[PDB]
Amino acid sequence: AMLYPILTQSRMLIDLSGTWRFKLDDGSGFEKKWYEKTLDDAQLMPVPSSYNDIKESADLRDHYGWVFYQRDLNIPAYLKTQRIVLRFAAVTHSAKVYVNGTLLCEHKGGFLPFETEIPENLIRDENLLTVAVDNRIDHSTLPVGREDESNVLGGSFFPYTPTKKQNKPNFDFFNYCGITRPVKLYTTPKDAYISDITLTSSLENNTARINYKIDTKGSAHTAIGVYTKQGVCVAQTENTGTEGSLTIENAVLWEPLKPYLYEVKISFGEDRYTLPYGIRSVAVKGNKFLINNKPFYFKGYGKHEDTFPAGRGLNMPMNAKDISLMKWQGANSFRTSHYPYSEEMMRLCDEEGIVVIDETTAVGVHLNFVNTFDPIEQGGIRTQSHHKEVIKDLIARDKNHACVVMWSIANEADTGSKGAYEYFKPLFDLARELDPQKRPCTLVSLQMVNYKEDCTIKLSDVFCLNRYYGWYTCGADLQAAEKMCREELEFWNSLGKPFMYTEYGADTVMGLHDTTDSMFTEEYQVEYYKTNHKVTDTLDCFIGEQVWNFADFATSQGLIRVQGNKKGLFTRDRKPKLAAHYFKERWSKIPDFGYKK
Amino acid sequence: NAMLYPILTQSRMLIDLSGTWRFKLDDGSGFEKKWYEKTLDDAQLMPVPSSYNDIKESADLRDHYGWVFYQRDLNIPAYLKTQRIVLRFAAVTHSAKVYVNGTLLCEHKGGFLPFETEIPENLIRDENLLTVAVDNRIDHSTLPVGREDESNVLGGSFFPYTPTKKQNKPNFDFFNYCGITRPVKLYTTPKDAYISDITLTSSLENNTARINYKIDTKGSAHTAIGVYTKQGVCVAQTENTGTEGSLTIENAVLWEPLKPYLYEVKISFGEDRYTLPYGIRSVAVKGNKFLINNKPFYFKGYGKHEDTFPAGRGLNMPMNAKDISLMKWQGANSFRTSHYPYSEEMMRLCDEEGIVVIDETTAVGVHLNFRVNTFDPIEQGGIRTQSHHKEVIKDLIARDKNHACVVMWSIANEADTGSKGAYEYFKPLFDLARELDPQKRPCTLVSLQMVNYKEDCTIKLSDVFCLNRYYGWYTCGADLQAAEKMCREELEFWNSLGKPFMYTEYGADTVMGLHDTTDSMFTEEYQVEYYKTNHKVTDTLDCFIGEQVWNFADFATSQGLIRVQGNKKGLFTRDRKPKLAAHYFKERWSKIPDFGYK
Ligand SMILES: [Cl-]
Ligand SMILES: [Cl-]
Ligand SMILES: [Cl-]
Ligand SMILES: [Cl-]
């Protein structure tokens, strides 16, 4: 259970972000127990931020292993009358958290929150908070790191021996690590408090019924009230226990680009918590993706959390800039490729009416780009257990978001190979079991020669395809790209279920131009997209287009990465390429609902 | 006036109120209709802290004239009422009205320095609204100055036209970024006895390092002070002490440029607890030398701006750290807070990192003639800024007095200091700065390039002459031989005065990616040749003790025919990428020591 920490009449909220001490592990930090004392001979690092790009050091950017963050934590003893909690919104990839040299918690998974109470007895007059952060990835982590597998995107013409041991990402984006999202101290009443809130809605005529389950610790009485934005109470139930329901007459529905959030206020004993909440329905019916019973057409992007110089770190001005650009362009949606995004972004999307495909950290689950899904004993991928935990934690965090309409279980896994169905079926079953709203589930399909053998066909409610007709195949032959595109997409269209692009694009360096089709130029990016839409616009089961990518982003180094991935419609500093203007024109003429009715 | 930086302590809560706020442009009725009394209706959302101008894609918002309203809910525990509850605004640009529920709590003028107000506990209901109205308007009474009838010298048209809407008329180059620029926080102290200010100075005579302290308090209680090394070893302490005293620091390590050392000075008063980082060092001007720890310093660095995309002037902690890392990579040791006080987070980071700072007021644009003279009597049209200028000096020194990194106060940038009345305007301000700084640091004003440079009143006022000169850009453009000759003729006059002088600005607009082997303005090669030409002169002058370029990085400005999407004089681009000249300076500054160059 991970409610977003907020300031309330029963809950303090103390941000610990700022300038922290920082030290690379030299192989002796745990042996010499650096967490027991002030870090010596240390640097300074902003928190929240990825650490890789803050300095000018390749040894720091390309570090392998642990680093140690630390700050002083001097708090009033009178907080000891309350329950005291340290919340880590995200520490990438793995964390060990120490207060005064006592290990308080550990966490695996770099993109979801975790928390620990501080035992009263540990809090001295002066305290040290130390966070050790591990950046290493392998066959057991999500995202996956290679072990003996070859570098496909960053391969040399002639092999060489690396100077130092390094991570081997099985994914494109740069392995930004550190204290990615805010660290905060918060409090709740000690004896009785709210641990979780679950809300589902049903629309009977113009009356919404909101079913609630309020999970609590301790013995007290539970109450719930639903308020309009302007502050009018529209439903209230007292002494309701855990489960109940209530109704809102003439409810205002949350719609894409037309958001409406009620405020759901909960009391339990002395505890107070307010959750914003939008009322909307999601259903797949035939080849339609229905939001509030209307056939939606996705217009948008796969994104990354990527800005300079914080890397993956929470950047709230850029989040607001990015949503503004989305509305400027006529987009209505994006996918959280390839990890859960910050709660601050997710809550902002609820407020702004941006639809979200919420995706796990499960990218790189692919050992043949020994079978990927062989038994662990025979060398198969070792991620399924953690994959289950990620699904649990992602849905627990994001279940109440109106903006989340579909779960993406994995990106570009080896879904055309033997054992893939056996790996994924329990994960799809888990997502359907745990999501109270029973939203659609998908996996994001890698381009593959044997596409009819993609186990997505047996599992997903929507088929989500990553396809690069005119880039990774048919480059500079867009007539051949159109023919190859049509041949495959007519197969998917024949299945009668909704399908969409979750990735399609062409690397494009701003400022490169040619009137005559030429890879990496701004004009070719436009022609690539025109060619694909010639096909997709004729297919009635094709219900959405999300480009790769919203913006240029950092990646590992190699011969096909021109200082990162250049498939953005915008540059890394959010400037529009020619194709950004193309999509503004195109999306201006396509309705959010009823394009393919 | 006293403004200790808010920190989390054993006696003090610190609750950051930054985040997503509601935001509404005023339409002329916001105060008449009392928008602050209810939830903002039909509002937008805006991140705090940030400038509001670049977050959306709206020219009407970017170029808005007048007021905007920010608002958020403020639901806090009633048990905080056993403490003193304070709302701290680190900066609201330019002027602010702060309401809790329907009640005006405070008003502030001055967009770049903090202000705070206690929240009366009777005002705190079960649910509260916090509304902040923010005014962006500038004129002859604000710092920075807005033009009234004066014409646009950097953005003039060939043919006059009537603007569609009334707009601000900046009398300064940089863009008029406004909004809640820096964090808003709630903090608490004990009610009955608390620390209001701490003043520390250093004494280094007789081979003995001592810290002198003055602790200002409210209420009645006992005072204690201890000084601690980085590793937490107490090196001096006393309990039940006076408000003023001194502590000897045995084995004292001095704060040095690029070799910082900060002690932790821990103070208690009653139940209140506060910790101040502090670097021990001396600053003095003697003859033609700028002495830090009695050694002859050479400034290497930049005039900066607080400018990043998309937050504008807003606090950007990752980029602050990036910028310091780039300065150290380049071999710089210093910068100037052009043209306004910077965030406390930046200043405290400079103390931690060993970056020397020239700390400048908001007084840019004090110039009505770039016929009424700038410093004519107010009643005949002269500039109306002197009263606020005094307040800014008091507030700046009160905020930054304890920083080792601050070695000089800059009283104003490019004022009309060659005109009649300038000395009379500035003498009380130099006197005030010298009276109020407990460390009595050097004072300067930053000198506009002017034909009659020998009449610059800086000569009668300043401890260091700080010159903005553009030999090879705004004069002698594409004639660097003439630039060298003109530069030498004037800088030999300054050298003949025998006092320390330096460049605080010099540079050439440079669009990254434009090149020519043959001297051509706006190319990366010309930027290098411009600097080579200037250094041919400055390296021969024994009283020239510092070079700060204009600018660290490209930054946003008002629109016009000589601003190629902002000011392009950065050594780095706005996204902090090095131009050819940034590599030139890395090589040059690598060969110039911080001490003993001249
Ligand atoms: Cl990627
Ligand atoms: Cl790609
Ligand atoms: Cl400027
Ligand atoms: Cl300039």
JSON list of C-alpha atoms and ligand atoms in Angstrom, two decimals, chain B residues 173 470 474 550 563 567 569, ligand 4:
[
{"chain": "B", "resi": 173, "resn": "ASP", "atom": "CA", "xyz": [18.74, 43.02, -21.50]},
{"chain": "B", "resi": 470, "resn": "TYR", "atom": "CA", "xyz": [33.19, 45.22, -25.53]},
{"chain": "B", "resi": 474, "resn": "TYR", "atom": "CA", "xyz": [29.85, 46.85, -29.72]},
{"chain": "B", "resi": 550, "resn": "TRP", "atom": "CA", "xyz": [29.92, 37.87, -20.42]},
{"chain": "B", "resi": 563, "resn": "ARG", "atom": "CA", "xyz": [19.06, 39.45, -30.12]},
{"chain": "B", "resi": 567, "resn": "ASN", "atom": "CA", "xyz": [21.80, 36.82, -25.77]},
{"chain": "B", "resi": 569, "resn": "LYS", "atom": "CA", "xyz": [27.50, 35.66, -25.60]},
{"chain": "C", "resi": 4, "resn": "CL", "atom": "CL", "xyz": [25.65, 41.94, -24.11]}
]
